[PDB]
Amino acid sequence: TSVGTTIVGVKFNNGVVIAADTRSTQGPIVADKNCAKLHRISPKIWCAGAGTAADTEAVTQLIGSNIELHSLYTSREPRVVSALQMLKQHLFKYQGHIGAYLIVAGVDPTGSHLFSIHAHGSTDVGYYLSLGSGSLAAMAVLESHWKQDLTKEEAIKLASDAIQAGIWNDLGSGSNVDVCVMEIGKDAEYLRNYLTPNVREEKQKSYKFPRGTTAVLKESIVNICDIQEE
Amino acid sequence: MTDRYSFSLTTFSPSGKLGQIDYALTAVKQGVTSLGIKATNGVVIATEKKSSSPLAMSETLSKVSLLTPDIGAVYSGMGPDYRVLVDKSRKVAHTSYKRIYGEYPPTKLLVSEVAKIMQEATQSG
Amino acid sequence: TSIMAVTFKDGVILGADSRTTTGAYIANRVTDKLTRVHDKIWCCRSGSAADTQAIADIVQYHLELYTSQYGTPSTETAASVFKELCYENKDNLTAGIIVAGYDDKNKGEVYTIPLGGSVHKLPYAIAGSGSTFIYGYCDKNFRENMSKEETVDFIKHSLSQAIKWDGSSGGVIRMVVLTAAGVERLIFYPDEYEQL
Amino acid sequence: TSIMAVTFKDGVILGADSRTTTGAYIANRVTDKLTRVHDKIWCCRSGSAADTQAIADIVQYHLELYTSQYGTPSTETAASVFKELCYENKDNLTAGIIVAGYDDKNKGEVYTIPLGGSVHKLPYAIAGSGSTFIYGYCDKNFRENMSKEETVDFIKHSLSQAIKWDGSSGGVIRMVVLTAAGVERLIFYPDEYEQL
Amino acid sequence: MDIILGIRVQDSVILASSKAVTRGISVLKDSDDKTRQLSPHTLMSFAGEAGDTVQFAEYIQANIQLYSIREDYELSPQAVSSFVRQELAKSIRSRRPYQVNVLIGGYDKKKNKPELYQIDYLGTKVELPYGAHGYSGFYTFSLLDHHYRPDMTTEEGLDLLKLCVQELEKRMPMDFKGVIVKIVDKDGIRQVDDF
Amino acid sequence: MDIILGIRVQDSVILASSKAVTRGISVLKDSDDKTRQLSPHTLMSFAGEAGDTVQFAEYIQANIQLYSIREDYELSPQAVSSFVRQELAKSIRSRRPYQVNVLIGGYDKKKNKPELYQIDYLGTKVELPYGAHGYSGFYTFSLLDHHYRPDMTTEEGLDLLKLCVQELEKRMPMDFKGVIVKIVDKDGIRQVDDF
Amino acid sequence: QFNPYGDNGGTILGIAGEDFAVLAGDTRNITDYSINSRYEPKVFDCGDNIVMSANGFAADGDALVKRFKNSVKWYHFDHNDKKLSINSAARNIQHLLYGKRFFPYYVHTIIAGLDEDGKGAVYSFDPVGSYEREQCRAGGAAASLIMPFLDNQVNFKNQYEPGTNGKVKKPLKYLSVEEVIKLVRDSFTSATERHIQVGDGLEILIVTKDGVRKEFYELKRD
Amino acid sequence: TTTLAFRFQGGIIVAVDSRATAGNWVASQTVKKVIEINPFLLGTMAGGAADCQFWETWLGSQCRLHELREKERISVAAASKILSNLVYQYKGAGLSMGTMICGYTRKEGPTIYYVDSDGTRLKGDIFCVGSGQTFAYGVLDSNYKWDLSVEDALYLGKRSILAAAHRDAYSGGSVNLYHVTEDGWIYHGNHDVGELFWKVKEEEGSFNNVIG
Amino acid sequence: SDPSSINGGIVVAMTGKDCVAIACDLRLGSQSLGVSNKFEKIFHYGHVFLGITGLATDVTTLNEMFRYKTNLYKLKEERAIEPETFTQLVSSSLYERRFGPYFVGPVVAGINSKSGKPFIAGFDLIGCIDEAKDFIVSGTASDQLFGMCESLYEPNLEPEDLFETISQALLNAADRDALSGWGAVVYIIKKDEVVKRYLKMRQD
Amino acid sequence: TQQPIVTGTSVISMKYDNGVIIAADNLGSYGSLLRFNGVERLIPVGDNTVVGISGDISDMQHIERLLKDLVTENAYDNPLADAEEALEPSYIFEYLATVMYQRRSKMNPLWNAIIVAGVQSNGDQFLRYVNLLGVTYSSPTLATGFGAHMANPLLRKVVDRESDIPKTTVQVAEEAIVNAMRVLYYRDARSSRNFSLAIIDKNTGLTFKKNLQVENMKWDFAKDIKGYGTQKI
Ligand SMILES: [Mg+2]
Ligand SMILES: [Mg+2]
Ligand SMILES: [Mg+2]
Ligand SMILES: [Mg+2]
Ligand SMILES: [Mg+2]
């Protein structure tokens, strides 16, 4: 299991919202400071992934691909329960070896939905969920401020506040907050870098070198063009 | 059981004709007219919705089909053959391209894949 | 997990807590462990959540296909399908399932399928980590042919004690009542059952 | 092993089964697990028989030497001596002891000392492998200030259930009653308690 | 087996390989030739796990001889080395990998150049002026780094090789029973029978 | 260390011990003398774990030299060997045992007889006409069993010893860098400086 | 099984100037993926114009600093209030560390100050007491991120004078205290960006002939 | 690490590299692997850095106590044996030491003892210890003579460390040279391997495999 | 034992104003033993550049595999593959070996021939894409490279300034790694000219 | 070396303008068995200090006796035992920290995590942590076990740095602590509803609250949750 990440999902009046931080790590080292953890399965079905990053990306693309073909075959817009069933049966078959822990949310003709799924293939239903190393920090905020019949504005606020708890308190999480809002009868709105509370301060010094600082042995032009005419 | 027809059903006649292909083209000739026109800023494809009965809801029968978000298809000939080819064309755009390059295939290459499927039904057992 | 199923005069009732843990962390405090495999055949799940969900989904599929061909399956038939999956795949599964159903011919029936994949038809059954603490209580307090209200009280009191002592159990007490009249869901909150 | 001690109006009663096993073999079916460390301070032993016998013998020695110097020790003092031995030698011991005694000033008192060597003063205590199955029953049925006859029934019924479910428990139910009137031994045979 | 050395000079490649074969406690043979001629102007020496070494070498030899007959043409040293690398790279993820390290010394008749390729059992290929496998490089590379020149004659190469073997015979704990030395040049392959 | 041999002939005891010292990868020395003179007519050779060998040998040497001064008398080879055995037998049940095997070659001036004692690190003592430790016996004992006579001269003993060393140099995988040979007789101890 | 050791993260940095020395360290204390404290001082004034930090397992770190401070106190008692010179302190710390050779203080220790000629001094220790006087030394979690930068910007490694193309090295000109502090701040700002255990705050202790001065700077708290 | 010491007509040459590594990470390029025991005795650092540092400065203290008590310079034999007997007491506990104790006295002449943490104590003419020892041995063995001049011997030691520094990944940084005479050791400077390599390559014509 | 650190080596890539730079060391070793100082880790297929660190046999294999695949791509597509597309191909190819992976750390660098936009990307051994705006690092001295890049890098550097920045980032990172060094190469890539420069560095 | 048998879960705490607050539940767990339901894990020392302890209960009872003995010992030959020479929170902590580190150094630890909360003679707030390893640290908010993961994030929203302490009243601080205890009851499988809470204020002294309960719980939303994906009934 790769350690990191804070992701949440929150149900509201007329839809569902998911959110995530933007830090990806390899051990104690930050590989990418502005990672995109909110993945699209279909236009109005989005998921966020924790655990092995390649697995969350790969399993999302595969099911997303099969969901698209299914949608074309049936002449119907994809359902969240289909994505859930296809994800869980794939993950169960690989007995946890595909380290994908996902929060799946979306809207479809049936309504708005929010599920979690765990690498071994178990799934859960809820009004508010959290996954990743910062899930306990996030869940603390959710358990403190969640109520029934939240508005769109209240749900976005709660979701991002839960991610912030992860950002500040969990070492596996950091940088920015990404948000995606899926409302019934509307286009899903992906809000990349919805919050940016971690811009690096200006450095004390410029480290631009004088030209000719580096010692060079040989120079040559590299032929990137194809074999030429004449 | 088992498919015991492992031999070609399309073969060259003494004159060099592939009979089954010619006869397939004859079936296409009997089919309802469809057309395509290319403009500078777009392409149009069109056909007639020849409804078999007025009790039939001809909107439920799609002769013009989306293959990818930027590619569409229309036909003339046997409808059921077209329908299964659209299913195969949609899937092959993903399996042999989108799952590899993370983008939809260019028109010419998807056409190439559909062409290959149709060629194989002309030589396979 | 604390789960049980109890036959009574008018049929059978399934009961369960709502806590799911990952170690000492409660991953879900409002879980639904009472799962429908047919209209009036339900089950209580214990063990691996992934395994028991996978098994239940396969059983639901089997009984749906059975119904399309041969009409409504018996509770025994449902228990047999559960057993077949649990027994044949015992090496790769961690699943303890109680099957409960209502026929009109057979009325309320309960079958328990422990870890090894054996089947045991019983008047009532208890399972899950919390069940250990109520073997004494349940054996002393169970009677055959109880009323609906008595059976609800029996399950409510039993699971109350299981929750009290077992850290892996908790949350709400969910119940599903299976009779000729239909299918009724019940829920009981902490403030109710903790004062019993 | 199934052991318990219960305070009541007139004092305290200790209860125990009589089975001792080596694996699945019953090495002794008529064991006395109720052991005297002073005239009206007794204990119930669970865990390693060698360890608990060694501890009890040392405690009996300590309380005998205490009595010669300072007069009759309190039940708290006896519990403290047990704890000192169990805590300080926790790495090398497997002992779960319930201490029960009667003072005239303090009346009936019960102290339980689990594996780690902590002390817990309680109205009643249960321990041993069989105790797990009667947490529900005992919690539901215990009342403070019961009569002698009620407390005997409570222990008899409780250990009956523990014996029924736990293979490591069985044989006769032994009891020792501690009151101002003195020390009374009771014994109850299988044909009596199995039909409860 | 143990020590295999290679050096590419002006007009030839020289391969030196130990003669000992040891079955744990006893030295069973002291005249073993750890090499196979793949083609008239390409020689391969080898060391690694018992049985696998000869099995691999003869398998490669058979394949190159087959190519030579089919095309009536000798593959370049580079082409042969790439074929050998692929076979070892294929082998490393097999059920039971070939535990074989090789040196390929060849004279390219088209370019009129000697070429030495070092390939380990993983399929790690490098073209070198001089190379070795195992611990051989640890004792010899400091001498080769010092004395080696790209314009050396064959006789100078043999003298530098003697100095390398002398250092091996001094500081190595194992008795490898001397080396068989072979030269690969424009005229083909020949063995130096006094070394 | 590695090979230590002993042979008792008519009028002397001959001990042969290898010269190599190997620190894993490299041979650090090729002139090491694996022996200590315990008294004027008693010599001990040794092999085993590094450090412990020399530490044990020098400890024994110090003790025998102390006895010699205290009593103004040289202990018999038998008496010295018994003392050495006891020290090793004591050591084997210690916290950290001496991992040292020894040969004790002495000339008993009272009986006018050469004597060879073989003692391993457990304290297992045997008096022998010829002996060894480690794998040395496996290669040499068949030759000694064939040629050995109790009435051999010192020169014949050295010749039989040469045949043993030649067989070791042929069939042993390790290069032990030859042997230092010492003779113990009525006149004391001396080293054969050409072998 | 009981593990007597732990890892409290943290990163420290010592630089010796011409007539000054700085010892800096972040103020974040952690276990696994949790923050224990955003401000837990790690660099200490030990008296006699010496500053010290023992980074790694904080319990051992606190124990060592405490015992060294105590050693300074007793050095004054036993040797007529003589000032403990930085070289003498360094040798003393070696013996404190090597005393637990077979159950080591799991820390990387750095001390800073001035030598007996008034020049800047930094000493660096491994867990079991091997030490050396150095010009520049980072310790702890992000040491591998900081040292290469310092090799380049303090010692001008791989930098040559323009026009000569590798023939003439960039001359090693002396840095002021203001210049060193700039490099320290940029080292920790960069480390904060790329290492999860580095952040919250930066505390720098500066040593001169006038005494020990402190400077504090905020670091990112994510 | 690469350390060497060899005896010759003019005394002893001691040469060492300067690199310390923790796994693949280069901890230091400025490590001192020659321990100045006293003005007449030198020891080399290999294995455990602390073990070598600590116990060889301790050895200096024992040597100082010896000459105070006996009013005479300690022999290299006696100095080396104090160290070997000490580490032998700790055998099994996990000390890590591979060192050359080097000195030049009246009674002995130039003397080198290889001392090891498993109790080994070997007198010899040439010793080389560390991860790059095999490379340095090659240059030493092929160029060593007893009748080397002090200048040529110093270069040989420098060149042998350079050989190891080039090929061994865990050796490098700089070369430290010492010359041990009867009147004491003399330091012959710190030589950066980066600058030394190119200098030697050009002047010597060696390392033709490397482009410069 | 650890396959990703048997051979050693590093790769770093950076973006600048209308340009990208990719650089690598030249070492191949067998743990402590240096084996080759000419083992280049950067390859190119048309105008797309690929650096690969890790196990050297897999470095060679993957180069041959992506040459294979980009050659077929070009024949069928009738155009050279673009950096964005190639990145997805590298990701797909690595993930197909999910449970028997190539032990590598690939790095893509190039300029899109149609948009002119500079592009860099990095991968773990199993295909996860890191698409950073600023810089990508890989290899046994990746920690050191992260430290160098984070402090030395600034956006919109001109080609000849970017050369100095990336060169100094590589050099000083390699000199703090035992298994990296033995020479270095830097590619400066513009929309229709690429310059390759071998750097002078210490050889220990 | 041992293993904890009977255990206590989180201890949580924070500073406010005039003092400190500390809280811990009344459960003594025996693995997953919620064995003992009336365990006091906050132990007051004098009228200025409260020591909160998690982990092994047998070791907690041992520490409880050490503190009791410390008060006895301080009173010996000490006329100012209830005035200038009374035990300070800083004295009590340093003593415990010494013991904890010594015990871990003998490879025989007291298997606990401890938070010492109090107010010093000069009115300064004292809050510091120590555990089985002898590791110590201070912070405006401190918590052990689960509390570290779930309580700290909530408490840090009230006091995020040192300058927030004077702006935080006792009512706001207690509210935050009580909410955190509810969150822990929702999410920690080894927690109980019953807890104790102690306030040490420089003006009003030590207020020790027993038999507190988690209240205002949200469970109603559970009735709408059905199945684990597709189930509607
Ligand atoms: Mg029984
Ligand atoms: Mg023997
Ligand atoms: Mg964070
Ligand atoms: Mg000594
Ligand atoms: Mg090197």
Curated annotation (Swiss-Prot), chain A:
Molecular function terms from GO: endopeptidase activity; threonine-type endopeptidase activity
Enzyme Commission no: 3.4.25.1
Top-tier EC class: hydrolase
Keyword set, alphabetical order: Cytoplasm, Hydrolase, Nucleus, Protease, Proteasome, Threonine protease, Zymogen
Active site: T5
CDD domains membership: proteasome_beta_type_7
Alphabetized Gene3D superfamilies for the sequence: Glutamine Phosphoribosylpyrophosphate, subunit 1, domain 1
Gene Ontology annotations for the cellular component aspect, listed alphabetically: cytosol; nucleus; proteasome complex; proteasome core complex, beta-subunit complex; proteasome storage granule
Keyword Amino-acid biosynthesis: no
SUPFAM superfamilies the record matches: N-terminal nucleophile aminohydrolases (Ntn hydrolases)
Source taxon at top rank: Eukaryota
A Pfam family: Proteasome
Catalytic activity: Cleavage of peptide bonds with very broad specificity
InterPro entries in the record: Ntn_hydrolases_N, Pept_T1A_subB, Proteasome_bsu_C, Proteasome_bsu_CS, Proteasome_sua/b, Proteasome_suB-type
One Gene Ontology biological process: proteasomal ubiquitin-independent protein catabolic process
Protein's cellular compartments: Cytoplasm; Nucleus
Primary residence: cytoplasm
Oligomer status and interactors: The 26S proteasome consists of a 20S proteasome core and two 19S regulatory subunits. The 20S proteasome core is composed of 28 subunits that are arranged in four stacked rings, resulting in a barrel-shaped structure. The two end rings are each formed by seven alpha subunits, and the two central rings are each formed by seven beta subunits. The catalytic chamber with the active sites is on the inside of the barrel.
Note: The side chain of Thr-5 acts as a nucleophile, and the N-terminal amino group acts as a proton acceptor.
Entry's family note: Belongs to the peptidase T1B family.
From Swiss-Prot, chain B:
Keyword Nucleus recorded: yes
GO cellular component, one term: proteasome complex
GO terms (BP aspect): proteasomal ubiquitin-independent protein catabolic process; proteasome-mediated ubiquitin-dependent protein catabolic process
Keyword Cell membrane on entry: no
Annotated compartments: Cytoplasm; Nucleus
Keywords noted in UniProt: Cytoplasm, Isopeptide bond, Nucleus, Proteasome, Ubl conjugation
Family recorded in the similarity comment: Belongs to the peptidase T1A family.
Assembly description: The 26S proteasome consists of a 20S proteasome core and two 19S regulatory subunits. The 20S proteasome core is composed of 28 subunits that are arranged in four stacked rings, resulting in a barrel-shaped structure. The two end rings are each formed by seven alpha subunits, and the two central rings are each formed by seven beta subunits. The catalytic chamber with the active sites is on the inside of the barrel.
Note: Present with 7060 molecules/cell in log phase SD medium.
Biological role stated in the UniProt entry: The proteasome degrades poly-ubiquitinated proteins in the cytoplasm and in the nucleus. It is essential for the regulated turnover of proteins and for the removal of misfolded proteins. The proteasome is a multicatalytic proteinase complex that is characterized by its ability to cleave peptides with Arg, Phe, Tyr, Leu, and Glu adjacent to the leaving group at neutral or slightly basic pH. It has an ATP-dependent proteolytic activity.
Record-given protein name: Proteasome subunit alpha type-2
Residues of the full protein shown: 1 to 125 of 250
From Swiss-Prot, chains C, D:
Keyword set, alphabetical order: Acetylation, Cytoplasm, Hydrolase, Nucleus, Protease, Proteasome, Threonine protease, Zymogen
InterPro entries registered for this protein in UniProt: Ntn_hydrolases_N, Pept_T1A_subB, Proteasome_bsu_CS, Proteasome_sua/b, Proteasome_suB-type
GO cellular component: cytosol; nucleus; proteasome complex; proteasome core complex, beta-subunit complex; proteasome storage granule
GO terms of molecular function: endopeptidase activity; threonine-type endopeptidase activity
Keyword Signal part of the UniProt annotation: no
PROSITE patterns xref list: PROTEASOME_BETA_1, PROTEASOME_BETA_2
Lineage top rank: taxon: Eukaryota
Compartment list: Cytoplasm; Nucleus
Predominant location: cytoplasm
Catalytic activity, as annotated: Cleavage of peptide bonds with very broad specificity
Gene Ontology BP annotations: proteasomal ubiquitin-independent protein catabolic process; proteasome-mediated ubiquitin-dependent protein catabolic process
EC number(s) from the headed UniProt entry: 3.4.25.1
Entry annotation: catalytic residues: T1 (nucleophile)
Additional remark text: The side chain of Thr-1 acts as a nucleophile, and the N-terminal amino group acts as a proton acceptor. Present with 7250 molecules/cell in log phase SD medium.
Membership in a protein family: Belongs to the peptidase T1B family.
PANTHER family, alphabetized: ATP-DEPENDENT PROTEASE SUBUNIT HSLV (PTHR32194:SF0), METALLOPROTEASE TLDD (PTHR32194)
The name this protein goes by in its record: Proteasome subunit beta type-1
Curated annotation (Swiss-Prot), chain J:
Function: Non-catalytic component of the proteasome which degrades poly-ubiquitinated proteins in the cytoplasm and in the nucleus. It is essential for the regulated turnover of proteins and for the removal of misfolded proteins. The proteasome is a multicatalytic proteinase complex that is characterized by its ability to cleave peptides with Arg, Phe, Tyr, Leu, and Glu adjacent to the leaving group at neutral or slightly basic pH. It has an ATP-dependent proteolytic activity. PRE3 and PRE4 are necessary for the peptidyl-glutamyl-peptide-hydrolyzing activity.
Additional notes on this entry: Present with 16900 molecules/cell in log phase SD medium.
Subunit comment: The 26S proteasome consists of a 20S proteasome core and two 19S regulatory subunits. The 20S proteasome core is composed of 28 subunits that are arranged in four stacked rings, resulting in a barrel-shaped structure. The two end rings are each formed by seven alpha subunits, and the two central rings are each formed by seven beta subunits. The catalytic chamber with the active sites is on the inside of the barrel. Interacts with CIC1.
Gene: PRE4
Location in or out of the cell: Cytoplasm; Nucleus
Signal peptide (residue range): none
Name of the protein this chain belongs to: Proteasome subunit beta type-7
InterPro entries, A to Z: Ntn_hydrolases_N, Proteasome_beta4, Proteasome_bsu_CS, Proteasome_sua/b, Proteasome_suB-type
Main localization category: cytoplasm
